[PDB]
């Protein structure tokens, strides 16, 4: 498989779902544009800015070794061998992965070589356990909080009889387990609990929907699903003409790919995303990307062909521009940039203590000690989030986690007939909803 | 800790045993583990000696060992298991173990990256049957769907319809109880409460579990899918709180003495399960003849001796003891250990017969052994009479399509015998249907 490599004095590993999961034979399927390509390019954008920052590692260039997880933990683990083979390349730290199952599988390999790891999207509560994930940190909070936010949405609307659907794996199952605990504490009962396996068919999704219809009093379906599972569930529901009030986690969030083609089935859905903002300079950087000037990204030409349904062989790709089309910044881009900066700040603070007389890598950091870097620097960073709007701070808590803050969205059909996500609320140690923005709310 | 049991050979087999219990929050390794630790490790060494003398099983190919200690911890086991792959980055042809499902899964994730076949003698988690994830794993034991079905059938037989469940956190406990619950539901069995035992539970936290179970006085039956230490500590807490429960426990508790020792009263009337087996021949004699001077090959034996006879070698006079003098109860899964080692030798033998026909020695075609072909073409197709089987038995060793063993279990009850001593009695079995006889059950 191909790899993205950038030269530096210290090299940061990267892990992203550049491609979707493949079919029954192949590990890798189509290019994953939003949570794959954009997130990868956000890490490249962050590295470029750090490398030109006079106040952050002025004498230490940050390189990269970025791998594709193909949205599959076993494939991510096979790729993750490149990070450790230079110990039986030299990787100082790893940024990634996205999926909780990928981050857990990778963390269990990285800790064996004391490589620090910072995830920008893995929300599984299991990852908060430092006796098991002692080299793991994340810029995102655990789903202990997300599950409360979802139980409280149901409690506010008095939805006391609901069904649940969880993605098989750490994320979905432990997320739904936390949701169900939090719902029972607020006297919300569960009609049925469905599961979506890691290799389900389109007909098997229709089975899930039929199973949810077997309890007609439960109109509210609570999802702790991966985007693809939310997408297929919704497509199955459109096909069987089933109507549900969806309440879904960040896996769905405010992704257009989830609802595209099943807008009618999704209408009225309440979704959650981790509280974030779009990073302004990232948008001009991404929209400038060009298949002729972006050779450092080995998956960019395959992304271009898919996005613009063109062929470089057929010479019909140049007519397209990311400048000439609309740009929707993926919700967790801020978390990617914060993870790269958190690692850069940690190495900078380590450099200040270990190399006081030079801006260059002194012998004390040849090589970088993984234990010290994680325990005494990564966990202790505290800085103002870069490219933030006119206020956020990057830091890790005692479990190496981010802050439990969430945005609440609703999926609606506007007066024009066009569909959109609309921010209707917020959760941060308590629920705040603006019912005037929810079309079906009284 | 960092001791490794090494034995030279033409082909080296990796080994993995919980030679020590898990330590406290500051140490990876705790006290030496006699029954599921020392005895199983010794059973592998016993099998290797007997294979290495056998003229019909690899006559010109000596099998070596690289045996590691998991310390009953999946993170520790995996740090140790790097030894198995550091060459492929001495060469390891296949691996025997581990015991705990979480250990076996963690190691299988690593070994498959290097196409290293693995055979467990005790990990029963259904997750391990998934060949999209554990394509180099096989086992001499069945997956826990069968154990969980057997448990739901035991309840249904006695009309125990409102019950409680206790699971050790992880892929053995949680998935075992989850399977049990689906089988119990279909048999009109309800669940009062479901408790989880965390990996770092305190004496107070176990008492909290007992009180959580007491909050439902209608449910006197508690179904356990727990690791032996969790069951030991839950019984200890029940004894402390004068709590009375009808225990229905998986192989984790099984027929272990250590689980019941000191909590006999809280344990009395327990229905426990173990995988169907027999004590093997020659091993009882092999184990009892072990001394701190002849057994230098096992670096953990002196520490086992010190624990067993409650003495110290530094202070001396530990020597004036013998395993022959003390009684010997062969650990229930010793047969699975020997079967796993023999399964690998037979797969290696059959591969040798096909790829090296012109010599009894290791030819080029097996220099190195191709792990993918070893697993797919030979390990999955082994079929042989179980070594050291008892008189007038037709036990065979084989694997199904997915590398799993056959769902056959023995059912036990924990009772006070006529001599006043507390003990486990065989009162039934499950092999595609429940057979138990009420007569041997005192209640
Ligand atoms: N929070 C998730 C997880 O697996 O931990 C759910 C699905 C996938 C989300 C994302 O990449 O934005 C990440
Ligand atoms: N069957 C178990 C498992 O973890 O899969 C339960 C606890 C431990 C048992 C044993 O070593 O005898 C093994
Ligand atoms: Cl990923
Ligand atoms: Cl083990
Ligand atoms: Cl245990």
Swiss-Prot record, chain B:
Glycosylated residues, chain numbering: 159, 242, 294, 358
An annotated GO cellular component: presynaptic membrane
Sections of the chain in a coiled coil: none
Any one biological process term the GO annotation gives: regulation of glutamate secretion
Location relative to the cell: Cell membrane; Synapse; Cell projection, Dendrite
Residues the record lists as binding L-glutamate: 36, 40, 101, 122, 124, 251, 333
Regions of this protein lying in the Extracellular compartment: 1-443
The entry's keywords: Cell membrane, Cell projection, Disulfide bond, G-protein coupled receptor, Glycoprotein, Membrane, Receptor, Signal, Synapse, Transducer, Transmembrane, Transmembrane helix
Tissue specificity: Detected in brain cortex (at protein level). Widely expressed in different regions of the adult brain as well as in fetal brain.
UniProt key word Coiled coil: no
Keyword Amino-acid biosynthesis attached: no
Topology of the protein relative to the lipid bilayer: Multi-pass membrane protein
GO MF annotation list: calcium channel regulator activity; G protein-coupled receptor activity; glutamate receptor activity; group II metabotropic glutamate receptor activity; scaffold protein binding
Cystine residue pairs: 29-71, 311-318, 356-363
Family listed: Belongs to the G-protein coupled receptor 3 family.
Complex formation: Forms heterodimers with GRM3 or GRM4. Interacts with TAMALIN. Interacts with HTR2A. (Microbial infection) Interacts with H5N6 virus protein HA.
Protein's job: Dimeric G protein-coupled receptor which is activated by the excitatory neurotransmitter L-glutamate. Plays critical roles in modulating synaptic transmission and neuronal excitability. Upon activation by glutamate, inhibits presynaptic calcium channels, reducing further glutamate release and dampening excitatory signaling. Mechanistically, ligand binding causes a conformation change that triggers signaling via guanine nucleotide-binding proteins (G proteins) and modulates the activity of down-stream effectors, such as adenylate cyclase.
Protein name, as recorded: Metabotropic glutamate receptor 2
Organism in which the protein naturally occurs: Homo sapiens (Human)
Gene designation: GRM2
Residues of the full protein shown: 22 to 487 of 872
């Amino acid at each position: 498989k191909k790899v993205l490599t950038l030269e530096g004095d210290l090299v940061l590993g990267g892990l992203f779902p550049v491609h979707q999961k493949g079919g029954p034979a192949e590990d890798c399927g189509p290019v994953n544009e939003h949570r794959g390509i954009q997130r990868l390019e956000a890490m490249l954008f962050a590295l470029d800015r750090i490398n030109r920052d006079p106040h952050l590692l002025p004498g230490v260039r940050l390189g990269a070794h970025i791998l594709d997880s193909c949205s599959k933990d076993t494939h991510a683990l096979e790729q993750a061998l490149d990070f450790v083979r230079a110990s039986l390349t030299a990787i100082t730290g790893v940024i990634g992965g996205s999926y909780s199952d990928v981050s857990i599988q990778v963390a269990n390999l990285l800790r064996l070589f004391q490589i620090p790891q910072i995830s920008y999207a893995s929300t599984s509560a299991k990852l908060s356990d430092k006796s098991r994930y002692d080299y793991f940190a994340r810029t995102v909070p655990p789903d202990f909080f997300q599950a409360k936010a979802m139980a409280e949405i149901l409690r506010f609307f008095n939805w006391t009889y609901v069904s649940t659907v969880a993605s098989e794996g750490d994320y979905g199952e432990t997320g739904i387990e936390a949701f169900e605990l939090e719902a029972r504490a607020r006297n919300i009962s569960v009609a049925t609990s469905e599961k979506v396996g890691r290799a389900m068919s389109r007909a098997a999704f229709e089975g899930v929907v039929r199973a949810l219809l077997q309890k007609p009093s439960a109109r509210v379906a609570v999802l702790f699903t991966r985007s693809e599972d939310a997408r297929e569930l919704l497509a199955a529901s459109q096909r069987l003409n089933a109507s549900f009030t969806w309440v879904a986690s960040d896996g769905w969030g405010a992704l257009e790919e989830v609802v595209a083609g099943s807008e009618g089935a999704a209408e009225g859905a309440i979704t959650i995303e981790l509280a974030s903002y779009p990073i302004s300079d990232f948008a001009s950087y991404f929209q400038s990307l060009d298949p002729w000037n972006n050779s450092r990204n080995p998956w960019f030409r395959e992304f271009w062909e898919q996005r613009f349904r063109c062929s470089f062989r057929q010479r019909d790709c140049a007519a397209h521009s990311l400048r000439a089309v609309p740009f929707e910044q993926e919700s967790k881009i801020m978390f990617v940039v914060n993870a790269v900066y958190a690692m850069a700040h940690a190495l900078h603070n380590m450099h200040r203590a270990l190399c006081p007389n030079t801006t260059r890598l002194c012998d004390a950091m040849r090589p970088v000690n993984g234990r010290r870097l994680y325990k005494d620097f990564v966990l202790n960073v505290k800085f103002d989030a870069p490219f933030r709007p006119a206020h956020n701070e990057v830091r890790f808590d005692r479990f190496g986690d981010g802050i439990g803050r969430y945005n609440i969205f609703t999926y609606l059909r506007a007066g024009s007939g066009r569909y959109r996500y609309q921010k209707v609320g917020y959760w941060a140690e308590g629920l705040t909803l603006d019912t005037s923005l929810i079309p079906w709310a009284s």
